Subunit: 130 residues, 8 copies
């Protein structure tokens, strides 16, 4: 399939929403190849918007998936290393798929010199940086 | 079972709050599947909330679980590596389940050049 | 035990204070299971407050414990890896139990361009971000 | 082929936007070599642009590729290490190809001493 | 021995200030156990202080200890891994025992877009 | 060659631009040694300026090179470790060669206490830090 | 030796200045033990001041030492791991000995939303945080 | 040779600027030892300067050296580990020899809650 086909695009969105990766989806019977999918995305805002929703759902599905990949790893050196790579890749991807939900979380307690107030001295510009 | 139904959603929340994973909960007869639970959440704001609170409850259980996974790890190379992966995955997840509680904690002492005041020039 | 029992809750607080993990405590003769303990916490502020104090004490006990886990590790590859995992888990947990005491500590010396003053240029909003 | 030529540059961009690496593109008959493509970019601002957009398109393809590299890794120690290197190199590159999209994501809750207000003294 | 007693607390502090760990100190006859020492600290502010200063003193001893652990490590794989764990645990602990002295040290050169001034818009 | 030779310097710039490292370039027939090259750089602004342009081009060439080093690694423990070291060294170097393009990229969502506004309390100086 | 002995303290400062660790110094013929040295430091400002200068010199000596430890490592798995531990320990220590010189160095290019200006909205306090 | 002497100090600087390490320089006949060179630096501000510039020059040589250490590493496990240590030690050192040039480089896009403006309340 090369021409944009909304029915097919909708199926792609459903499968992605469940956590399946695009390349895996594109290997299913009668699916377009990845390049085609990206071309459809480029030219059809309806698909782009639905794909965005699917990406968010995909992230939530994968968030559950990572526990399973770790917990069920075969206790063999190489298989555990592979499970780790699969989990690490998903962790990294999740933060990009939904930064607000899955990005890193830090609380910074900001203090100044010797645990007192933060000391700031303001001065006139001393060079032309404007 | 795909039609949104309170009570069932109230049941899921209770199951989660008691430490049970969403995966396992949805494997129970009569339970909506994973994708259905999400769809619900998305189209229902009252569920999004009650589920978020169960999520924090669940995180409190997982926090205690990591101690057990580490301490009871089988002292064989691959099993220790697996235990480490299980713990690392949980640590990462906890921060996302309750960021205020389980996020990273840093105290930054902010000083200026040579330990003097922070020097700022403004235009 | 399912109904809230203050005597039992007090014992839990004492054991936790000494550094024992909740799951370990809950395996002792006649203790409630972890789920039960969390339910008690949810519904009884007296217990929640005492549990909070115990958590702080638990953290101080574990802070001493980590040196022992490292120092006494059996010099065998897998046992050292296990000791490391046990220590790493405690280090991570301690920062969450008492962030002010056990969180990371950084001193940031803040300087500007070429080691001079920090250069700031303020402008009127150029878009509606209010 | 060293003289700057649009259309050819438009072709390169299309090839990139479809997932193909610059290396491979330049290995095609009639294609300028790597160094020539750059020289072009430098001395032509309209090309710098159209190529940057193809670069973002390419990054979107690579993003999906990392899932496959990880999931289909051969379960042998060296092959898993190689897969990890291929994935790590792509993750690092993606952040540079489209920083807004693939850069690191952090939420910093900024508080002051003991969780109170941030205390500042100014001269 | 559970009742708070100065002099004994003054003794503990001295023992700590000389490099001895709290664990070892409490293993001495007549010494309160670990939990008792804490309880004291909590309900006595004058002890919390004198103990904090001994803690900084102890950290200064541990700082020198890490050099020895590393340099004298037995050149066998597991023993080196153990030495590394002992050193890493001490490095982490030192930062918490005296944050001003043993915390991480970073100098951040703060600049704006393209190395120009930091651009701020305010409402 | 010890005396500054613009023809030779130009060749150095071309080779570097293509991604070759300076030490490798300096091992080619009739090239100056690295020390000589650095001396030329110190004393000739024409060369320094051209070398700066070459460094930027060198970085773009290496950015393509790293995929190849990873993808073509021999699946043998030591060779993969070597490929990793070669890639890691290039990644680190690229950020120094062109910081704006190849430095780390982070988006920081800045919030305050409990996810509300960032709370700032300003006070008069309480010590002489001016 | 238990009583403070300036001659001995001066020697300690010289040896430390050259890069030797305190515990190693204290194992030399006729040197005080580490505990004694720390007690002397606590009670004698003259020694404390000279020790501070020695610490700075010690750091500069170690900074040269780390290249040698790495470069001369025996190419055996365990010996290389030991060399790494020795170097890593020194790197960490150097930043504490002289934070200004040996601390981490970062240049942060600060930009705002979409690479434009940093957008700040100021509001009246909405809670009593003063 | 312990008495401060210009010309000799000018020679050291030249030796350093040409890539030679201080260790090696001081191993040359007639050269002051390591400790003497420092003492000089401390009690002479004009030397501190000329030496700092040689240090930056030296760093530029080491920068190129890391490429060679990595690329020419012997493909045996321990030798690759050693090469990695040699490279890592140099990377760390470079940042301290010339922080402006070889320090870490980060671009931080600073935004507020939900990607809106950064919200600040002041007292």
């Amino acid at each position: 399939p090369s021409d944009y086909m909304p029915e097919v695009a909708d199926d792609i969105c459903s499968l992605l929403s469940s956590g399946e990766s695009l390349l895996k989806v594109c290997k299913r019977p009668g699916m377009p190849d990845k390049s085609t999918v990206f071309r459809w995305l480029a030219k059809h805002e309806d698909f782009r918007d639905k794909y965005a929703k699917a990406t968010e759902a995909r992230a939530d599905s994968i968030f559950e998936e990572i526990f399973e990949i770790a917990d069920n790893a075969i206790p063999d050196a190489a298989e555990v290393a592979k499970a780790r790579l699969r989990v690490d890749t998903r962790k990294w991807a999740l933060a990009r798929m939904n930064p607000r939900k899955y990005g890193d979380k830090v609380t910074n307690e900001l203090v100044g010199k010797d645990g007192g107030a933060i000391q700031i001295e303001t001065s006139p510009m001393s060079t032309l940086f404007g």
